[PDB]
A paper describes a structure:
The AMP-forming acetyl-CoA synthetase is regulated by lysine acetylation both in bacteria and eukaryotes. In the first half-reaction, acetyl-CoA synthetase activates acetate using ATP to form acetyl-AMP under the release of pyrophosphate PPi (adenylation reaction). In the second half-reaction, the thioester acetyl-CoA is generated from the mixed anhydride acetyl-AMP and CoA releasing AMP (thioesterification/thioester-formation).
Crystal structures of AcsA from Chloroflexota bacterium in the apo form and in complex with acetyl-adenosine-5′-monophosphate (acetyl-AMP) support the flexible C-terminal domain adopting different conformations. In contrast to the previous report, at least in this case product formation of the adenylation reaction alone, i.e. binding of acetyl-AMP, rather than CoA binding is sufficient to stabilize the thioester-forming conformation, which is capable of subsequent CoA binding. We show that AlphaFold2 is a powerful tool to generate initial models, however, as shown by the experimentally determined structure of acetyl-AMP bound AcsA of Chloroflexota bacterium, AlphaFold2 is not able to predict all conformations with various ligands or combinations thereof adapted by AcsA. Notably, we found in the apo structure and in the acetyl-AMP-bound AcsA structure of the Chloroflexota bacterium a phosphorylated histidine residue, i.e. His476, in the C-terminal domain.
Residue numbers in the entry:
A (entry chain A), B (entry chain A), C (entry chain A): 14 to 640
The structure:
Amino acid sequence: LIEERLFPPPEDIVKNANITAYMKSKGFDDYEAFYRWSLANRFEFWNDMAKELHWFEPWKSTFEWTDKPFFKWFTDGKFNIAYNCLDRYMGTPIEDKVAFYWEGDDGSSRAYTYKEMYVLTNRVAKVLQNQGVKKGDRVAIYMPMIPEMAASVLACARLGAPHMVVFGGFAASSLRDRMNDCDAKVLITADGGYRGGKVIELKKIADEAVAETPTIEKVFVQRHTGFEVPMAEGRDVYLDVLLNDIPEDTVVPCEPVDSEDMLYILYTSGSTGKPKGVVHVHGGYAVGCYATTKFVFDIKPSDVFWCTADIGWVTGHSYTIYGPMMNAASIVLFEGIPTYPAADRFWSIVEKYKVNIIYTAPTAIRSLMRFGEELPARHDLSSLRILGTVGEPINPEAWMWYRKNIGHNELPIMDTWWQTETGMILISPTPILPLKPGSASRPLPTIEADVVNKDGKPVGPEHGGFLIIRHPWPAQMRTIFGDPDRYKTYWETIPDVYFAGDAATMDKMGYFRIQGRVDDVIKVSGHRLGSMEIESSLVSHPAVAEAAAIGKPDEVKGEHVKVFVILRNGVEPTESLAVELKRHVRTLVGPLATPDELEFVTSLPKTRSGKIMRRVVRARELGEPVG
Amino acid sequence: LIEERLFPPPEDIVKNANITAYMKSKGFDDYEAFYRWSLANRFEFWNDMAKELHWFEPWKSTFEWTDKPFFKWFTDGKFNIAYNCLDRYMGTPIEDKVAFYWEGDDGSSRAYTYKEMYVLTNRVAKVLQNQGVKKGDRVAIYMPMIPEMAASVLACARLGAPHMVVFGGFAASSLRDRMNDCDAKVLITADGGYRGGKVIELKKIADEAVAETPTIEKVFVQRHTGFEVPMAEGRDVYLDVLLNDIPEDTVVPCEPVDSEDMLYILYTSGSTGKPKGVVHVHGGYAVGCYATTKFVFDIKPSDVFWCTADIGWVTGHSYTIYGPMMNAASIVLFEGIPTYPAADRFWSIVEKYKVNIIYTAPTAIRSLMRFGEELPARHDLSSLRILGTVGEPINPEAWMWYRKNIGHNELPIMDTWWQTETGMILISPTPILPLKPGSASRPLPTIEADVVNKDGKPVGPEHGGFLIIRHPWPAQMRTIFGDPDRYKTYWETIPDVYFAGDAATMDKMGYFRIQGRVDDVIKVSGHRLGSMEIESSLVSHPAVAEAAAIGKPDEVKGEHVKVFVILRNGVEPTESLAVELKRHVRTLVGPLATPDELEFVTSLPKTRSGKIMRRVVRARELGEPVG
Amino acid sequence: LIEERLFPPPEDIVKNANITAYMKSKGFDDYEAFYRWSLANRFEFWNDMAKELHWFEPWKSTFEWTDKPFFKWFTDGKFNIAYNCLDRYMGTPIEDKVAFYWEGDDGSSRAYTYKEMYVLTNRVAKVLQNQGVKKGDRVAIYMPMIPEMAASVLACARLGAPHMVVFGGFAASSLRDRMNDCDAKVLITADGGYRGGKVIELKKIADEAVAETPTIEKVFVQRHTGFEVPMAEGRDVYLDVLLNDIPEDTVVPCEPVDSEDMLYILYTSGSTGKPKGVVHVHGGYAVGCYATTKFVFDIKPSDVFWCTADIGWVTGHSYTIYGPMMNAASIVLFEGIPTYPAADRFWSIVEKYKVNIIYTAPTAIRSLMRFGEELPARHDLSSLRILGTVGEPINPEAWMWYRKNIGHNELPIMDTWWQTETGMILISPTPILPLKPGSASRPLPTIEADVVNKDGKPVGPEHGGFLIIRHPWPAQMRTIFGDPDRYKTYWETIPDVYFAGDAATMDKMGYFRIQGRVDDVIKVSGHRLGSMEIESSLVSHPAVAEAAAIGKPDEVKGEHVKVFVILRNGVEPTESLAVELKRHVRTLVGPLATPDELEFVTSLPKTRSGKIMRRVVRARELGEPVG
Ligand SMILES: CC(=O)OP(=O)(O)OC[C@H]1O[C@@H](n2cnc3c(N)ncnc32)[C@H](O)[C@@H]1O
Ligand SMILES: CC(=O)OP(=O)(O)OC[C@H]1O[C@@H](n2cnc3c(N)ncnc32)[C@H](O)[C@@H]1O
Ligand SMILES: CC(=O)OP(=O)(O)OC[C@H]1O[C@@H](n2cnc3c(N)ncnc32)[C@H](O)[C@@H]1O
Ligand SMILES: [Mg+2]
Ligand SMILES: [Mg+2]
Ligand SMILES: [Mg+2]
């Protein structure tokens, strides 16, 4: 019933939207006709978008294959994404506009204008530059959500040194593996972070990792908690001590890099035992994050924007830092969690900063639904004009709860589908589309999405199949670091199209619904995990011979992990062992990837080539639906 | 599941039914074949029915168009419906049969034979006649459900003076508007009525209305409560004081009117800000109410019949007064409500009068379901042989509750579909049809119902569409008073067919299901309201600039009204204001039309011609289903 | 959702299964292809199976019609089923293997090897032989589930004297009617049995029955309770007193009977007022019970097998005694009920005997589900490797409960469809088939099952129809005792096929689902009852003129019986009368057939030939689904 209902947009949004203005300028009033034009005229569209940014040197060609399926956008353009986030606003009124509204776990707070971020980034860039960081060097970042995280990312960008951010919830093995895969040369971290009134010991974990990372030449430490932490002479140095000798008027000019020079690497979990470094580049990634931010979230000059995702994930890269800053938004940056000091924290933040756009995750919404409708009703949320969700299916009851309690039964919900590999939102409503609960809606301009069978034939309306995209888009990953074969499988699993690894349906009006992954990827509480990487993290333990990890449905977390463990012969299979195996995973990989359930078995299903048939494991537990 | 089950009729009803006997006399045993004959031979059918009543002069032609789409039945026949309800039973045994079993709110009671109603109607007709009432004059009636209401209606009928009954739950503006639209010359009312042990102040409300009704020359007041009420010298006079000088043997002969002379006007809420006076005429209306009563409720000489509807609505006109009296039934007339003194009141009444047929509303059933299965089980209900429901969809759980607790899992439920405009039941079971929960079943004889799209093409089994009727029937309204353009839209929205304004489905066996109105009509607790009339009743208030009224689903009431109100700039939008706006509506229009929910907004959706797009308002709140 | 899920078999069962080995030996690895071969080569299949047993003389022809639709299998073969259950294991290691693990109601217990059962059966055969029992004589058996029941059955078999077992829950009229229909010559019974710590007075009931059974020449009484019971001189004699004079080395050789000589009669309830004696014969019945037991339950040398059914029903004949003993299994025999002394009794038994295969009824599972997941978790059930259910639909929630709590989310559930008339399982999983909850899966080898309309046309995937079998199978009944016309209706209701009297569906993969009986059969708590036999048991009472019995859905019992009773005129219809009528049924027929609900009516629906239209009775109560 409820999923098949259409909700028309509120008053005043359609006539005023950014998408409407761009549509008009090309002669359209209807999204469907404009969309069809966008397929036939994709270069014109992306040229128009690219022209709204600053280029050091113009491009020759919008798009081209290099060695299919590798490609490029804005060939020979010289660019720096950091110039479009900072420098180009200097000497204009935007310099005094707030860029980041920082909000600490404990309720402390501080606002940073574009000018202040410009100055702070310049000075951090100088510190990195004096240590020997230069274009092409990888800079690892393991930080809590504080202004110096944002400044470190943009400082790397202005130097042309690709950043490699590791989410602060990962433990030492996870951190070590990511820095060794990409050969990071320096690490930027903090003494610690706060989550729910407790200290997270980032520096201690960083030590455990850096001891087994031979390329790390220096560790820079933000003094955030102020606790006494160990500091190796020579290697480890406090940022504030170095910044003391860097004047307030210091300028490091942006490095004019090629549009195809690396911006960052972000490790994502996949179908192998090792995470894959997705590589994004300055030019096309900037243009895509810019355009999607502008049209989906309808950014205007007076908007305060808040995306609740951590910067350690793609959503925080694209839609907390780069896309919003390129639209000159005022951006909320929050260090803490939804439930501390109490479960109305998000609604305090919205009221305090008069947030206009909130982009959050269903995991947060399902969490807060448990605490009742009274909590958000205690705050003034009338500043909100657009809501958004990302990362997983939002079930209809949560969508209704969101729209009712946070949106006063009026506000649109932008349910955005995309992935780390895609760089930008690809399938999503805009403010002009009528909404269906649980649907990501129609593709964005130029995005040629479809649902096909294993051979590439359209399955037609209302049938399930594989979600594919038929033509590159500017923000797509350009390679997987050190592993181009892994990149090619994305375009060569189904001939000539990009394979998302998601099941989907398209209904009679063209609205897409994403069912979930067709491979070994498991989403727990919003976080992407790989079955085979979890298995590895258990097989490392002396007690364990083999392991199979599956996802099981969970009301709060979406999925939880269960692992079937074969122990070495003779090992007594106890509750104490289960606790110990969970600790092993929690202290090496991190809490986010700790199994909730473990079961000890004496055999597992295997193909003849020795691989674990995970589908059979899951089917034995849960059954397999026919088709 | 449950809605798709077929329940065969009980023991002994099929062989004994009135419909079976009429079928046999034309050579049929199967309803489906008889029905098809009834379509090809509709004039024969209606002639047969008309011949069972008394005519002063016979008709020339069964049916004819005058100026299509106006038409007539029994042309040039001279008739009086009151003669078939009263006079023709005098000098026969039916004169001493009970006609009305009156039951007061407080449990007092009195039985009136056909002879006693004959005498009482004659005497009230004389009072009206001495005041100057004559054929064609409109007589307003605002009364509680007491015997003098029935006698006033039939007295008007015998004089040929169309009656205009205003339901006693309406307040002064509603009463004033109805009397001014039709230029009523006298008003018949009461000092007050009782509902749930409380006095309803009818005379006080009548004063407020009559002060702004310039055509009212006289107000006749029944002394029902006996409370001291104001009485303007000259205008207002007590009925009992006038009847004191009217002897017991007084006779006013029936006026032999044309079959097409006005019988009554009944204001119904529609798609405009003003209610519409549906005009019914003596001859075809009598014949239709007669035949439907006979076949659907299977009236026999020993039956006590009870329809729980108020006479202020069409159901009380057709199926409390005229149809039952023309079948010579003994009829229950109840002043009160289902829950006073306790929620077993209806079942006390059934047991007390050994009711054989009960025709009630789903609103009553849903109300009583709340109080448990114990209440009806405390009474002997074994006198019942037929149950009936009208006015709204009965959901399957309520149908089961009805059939189980009131019908001992045996009795048929006649789920009758019709409307004020149709005069008589059109789609309904008879005792010979197997029943489906929530289905109005097959059309009655001669009724050519179908489900079509906007152009008039059949949609075929199992698909939703517009319910239409293809050929007039005798009891249909002949016009809308003072507004023939409004009448014509009924036949010219879809070419050449009558458009009900209801959505419906027809299943594989021909059984119809009515989903609900496709226009701006809202049913609250059984009562028909118009969105645009509710809006008017708010816009009259100084605080309010504009309003949009929508229906929302409600478990007890079926729908409830919510109104979106735009206030004049500067008006503080408070809870006190909401209470005050509800009072404004309650004290002018009446409780039945008071909004349950009010929300203050600053804008509403409009077409370019300035009209309120109510569908968009509702869709924003509830969503719109696709199709 | 849940019913459409496929659950693949666990680890190690497919490669080791008996069915896999037989398949391989004919050149197959896939069940579907093997199944098709089994249809084209049914005689080869059944010859292969028959060769695994001992024959005194070989057969000439696998199958032939005699007078279609009567037929025979293994024509002219000389055989004795008891030789394949006992004698042929003597002088081999199987002689010292446990045959029966007997477990008393009170927790007492005793194990009997194949040798001990051989000796005990021989000695009981001698007692029967000395009394004058010989080939063709009918021996009635009314016993509790004790070792002497098993020995009495096999002793009859070795003498060639057909047994007629009457379930110990039946009362005297039921017992008398079964013995008079087949002219039983002796009765074997007990002083009493125990159920839930209470004595069931079998001997007292046997007296009431034998007084009206003129052919009974002798009653043999097992001393089980040891209570003082009446003993008529001449007729009634204690078994233990006779066995005292029968030496331990006594041998009665098996009678080499024709493959088509009667093995037993088992009365089953049908569509007439009298139960029907289904006749099974030694040869084909042995071969079918042998093969189905081997392949469905995958019996191996180390298996302990437990079927919870009473031997008084077909499931206990085929799958407690004959099929298991012919596979040389160790078999659990339990006297008691699931809930005494507590509702973990079944799980105590599994743990105590390390049961490997459990074959039980949904009635037991639905019963135990009421007591929570804690009870089975208190016992070690890890010995189980196969679960099974029979006799009625198992709803998905019960299937899940079974698989989760008893099967640790791994074990296959063999949902077996068959009937008394079929002798053996016909539609069922084997260990190699992926399972669907609530589905009986695919037909077993050579069984040509299909779903057809009333004329015999296939209805095709996903449509409901009549379940039929197209070609005989070895264990099918050969006749109905004294009533060959009743047998012929099974093959002549739908031309040329066997009509099961069940509705069914076949899905896209060929998996069958059995909805239920299309006739007047009612299953209550696993027990097959006939509407018309229940009616008879009420009409016998002086108060009652007529009766109609229907089945109504019941959460615990599956169905319960409600009876509509017409009383003689003048009889006061009271609660005391209802109690008395239930007692009448309980004390003559038995508790298993006592109505839960009785309603007194004054008329019932009848055809013109005077028969009760039960479908109309049920439809009036519950509705009839359309189709
Ligand atoms: C941005 C992000 O989440 O990136 P990433 O961590 O790489 O995960 C990507 C996978 O997330 C799932 N997913 C993302 N957005 C979704 C949405 N709106 N509706 C349903 N499923 C959604 C799919 O399964 C994707 O393939
Ligand atoms: C007699 C009366 O109610 O007249 P009225 O007040 O004019 O209302 C008429 C409207 O009522 C609804 N309606 C009436 N009977 C119904 C029924 N049996 N099943 C479902 N809906 C039913 C439809 O929506 C009609 O068009
Ligand atoms: C063995 C036995 O029960 O014999 P019997 O007492 O003669 O009853 C036979 C009737 O039982 C029902 N039935 C048996 N097994 C079933 C199963 N697995 N699924 C669904 N219904 C099943 C059908 O209705 C049969 O026709
Ligand atoms: Mg290991
Ligand atoms: Mg106003
Ligand atoms: Mg009798």
